[PDB]
């Protein structure tokens, strides 16, 4: 219908044009060195005040409704399935990582053990976890955390060598780039838990368990890899 | 002090204090007024490592002042050079607030509330940034809240139902600081046998108490923002 087509043009002018100008050729969308701006991303995907949420409220209130964090179509106006997938992916990321109106989440890590590993050191935005042999406990982390030098790093001591660096990933997305490198799987019998494993250069495993406050915690940001904001709302 | 101390004080006012006062004079929480201070602008000044104040300290005072965790300590005591004690107290108050409420580089913290009971109170409704807690004297549970929480209409409110009347409003405080304005009104004391807990009580207009227990993640949680009430950023670093 003409109303549907005018809405598609408005969606590009009000939202998509600016989204692509901000995030083209930026990590996490692409595996590149240049980082997406977290405050700019918040301005687009904030749950209630973001540019996308406001567009949905101002133009689609009668055909699309919130169901907690989900966006559900109200039972020549058929939605582009890519548009529905995209807004649902962004609403899930906003619910986990942008609750305060800016990027910010908490999670906990518990260090694990591995044959031949004497020590592990994981750092994110100057929050350090050194594990040698203390009783393993859950350490709370914040992402992002205010620092002059943001980034994440991981190191280990083996039975064959002194301290070695697995990776040093600078920038506000350092933690996310590091998580992208881990082997990840559901933790057996751990509520909202994931077993993380980084295979170090000597073949040894650097093991941790991740526990979140909600959903996938920081792993949710990986849903932005190769993410495309559709240019159309209706088919 | 000496010409070097005076030049540094002048740089402190040009780089930091002039802008701080332009942003925050006659704004809540600094003054008990209707106009609200900007939370993103406040973060740009007091962020622990990246804030305008922290950067001034790093760029101009690295040889006479250093960090000890979240704290700022004089080394410094170079001959005839002495800090204004109000300057040291002020940066340490801001450091404490930043450590509790600005860990992500923007305003943001979590806390939990558990509702309590009072004679003649049949319901209480507490709302902050559209997060609602309705209590009707059943088995009490903890509810998690975030401040700020993204919403089109920020603010906080509290209402109650009593034996003498239906729903009454205790307060409706709009704006990003609504929760803080509401917490300011409560009687507060350490909770008996609750780790990092405070018992909060609002004395409603009918004389009945609207009781809650607050549990925080770190320090005073949202109560730390009350340290900004009547806060003055000193115009001088050195005497
Ligand atoms: Zn937390
Ligand atoms: Zn720091
Ligand atoms: Zn909402
Ligand atoms: Zn007061």
With CB atoms and an 8 Å threshold, state whether A48 touches B102: no
A148 and B104: CB-CB below 8 Å? no
| CA nearest to B184, candidates B169, B159, B202, B196 | B202
Name the resolution in angstroms: 1.5
Structure tokens that stand for A136 in this block: 């393993």
Q: Do B149 and A101 touch (CB under 8 A)?
A: yes
Enumerate the domain spans of chain A.
Answer: 2-103, 105-219
Picking from A100, A104, A146, the nearest residue to B48 by CB comes out as A146
> Closest chain A residue to B131 measured between Cα atoms?
A99
Distance from CA of B12 to the nearest CA of A (A): 20
Whether the CB of A142 is below 8 Å from some CB of chain B: the reply is yes
How near does any CA of chain B get to the CA of A116, in Å?
34
Any bridge partners for residue A218, and if so which? none
Give the Cβ contact number of residue B117 at 10 Å: 11
B92's tokens: 């340490």
A103 closest CB neighbour out of B49, B104, B130 = B104
The first and second tokens of residue B211, run together, are 């009781």
- Contact with chain A for residue B107, Cβ under 8 A: yes
DSSP state of A13: I
Report d(CA B108, CA B104) in Å as an integer. 7
Helix axes A2-11, A51-59, angle to 10 degrees: 170
Contact call for B102 and A142, based on CB within 8 A = no
How far does the CA of residue B164 sit from the closest CA of chain A (Å)? 36
User: How far apart, in whole angstroms, are the C-alpha atoms of residue A190 and residue A81?
Assistant: 34
Measured CA distances, A177 to A207, B50, B53, B105, B111 (Å):
17, 22, 30, 20, 30
Do the beta carbons of residue B111 and residue B83 sit within 8 Å?
A: no
**Helix, strand or coil, per DSSP, at residue B141:** coil
CA distances from B84 to A107, A208, A219, B17, B231 (A): 40, 47, 47, 15, 16
Disruptive mutation site among B108, B129, B222 for chain A (greatest number of A CBs within 10 Å): B108
A147 neighbourhood in chain B, CB within 8 Å: 49-50
Strands A193-199 and A105-111: unpaired
Spacing, Cα A68 to ligand 3 middle (Å): 9
In B, minimum Cα distance to A105 occurs at: B104
- The C-alpha atoms of residue B55 and residue B61 are separated, in whole angstroms, by 10
Q: Which residues of A touch B217 (CB under 8 A)?
A: 106
Q: What angle do CA B107, B112, B114 make, to 5 degrees?
A: 150
Which tokens belong to B19?
A: 């802008």
Ligand nearest to the CA of residue A94, numbered in listed order: 3
Q: Say which residue the tokens 């007024």 belong to.
A: B33
Of B8, B12, B29, give the one whose Cα is nearest residue B230.
B29
Contact A204, A114 (CB under 8 A): yes
Burial of B41 (0-12, 13-18, 19+ CB in 10 A): middle
Distance B110 CA to ligand 1 centre (A): 6
- Chain A residues touching residue B99 (CB < 8 angstroms): none
Chain B touched by A91 (CB under 8 Å):
no
Interchain proximity B103–A47, CB inside 8 Å: no
Distances (CA, A) of A132 to A112, A119, A125, A168: 10, 5, 21, 20
CB contact under 8 A, B103 and A147: no
Ligand whose nearest atom lies closest to the CA of B103: 2
């Amino acid at each position: 219908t003409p109303a549907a087509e005018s809405l598609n043009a408005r969606w590009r002018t009000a939202v998509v044009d600016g989204w692509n100008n901000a995030f083209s050729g930026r990590y996490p969308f692409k595996n590149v060195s240049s980082d997406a701006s977290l405050p700019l991303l918040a301005k687009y995907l904030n749950t209630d005040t973001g540019r996308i949420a406001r567009f949905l409220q101002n133009n689609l209130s009668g055909v699309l409704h919130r169901e907690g964090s989900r966006w559900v179509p109200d039972t020549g106006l058929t939605f582009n399935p890519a548009f529905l997938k995209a807004i649902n992916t962004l609403s899930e990321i906003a619910d986990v990582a942008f609750t305060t109106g800016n990027a910010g989440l908490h999670f906990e890590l518990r260090p694990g053990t591995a044959a031949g590993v004497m020590q592990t050191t994981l750092i994110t935005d100057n929050q350090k976890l050194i594990y040698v042999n203390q009783m393993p406990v859950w350490k709370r982390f914040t992402w992002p955390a205010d620092t002059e030098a943001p980034g994440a790093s991981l190191s280990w001591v083996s039975t064959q060598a002194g301290t070695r660096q697995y990776a040093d990933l600078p920038g506000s997305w350092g933690l996310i780039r590091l998580l992208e490198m881990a082997r990840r799987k559901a933790a057996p019998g751990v509520a909202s838990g994931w077993s993380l494993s980084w295979q170090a250069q000597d073949g040894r495993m650097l093991n941790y368990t991740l526990r979140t406050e909600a959903g996938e915690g920081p792993l949710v940001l990986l849903k932005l890899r190769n993410f495309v904001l559709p240019e159309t709302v209706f088919e």
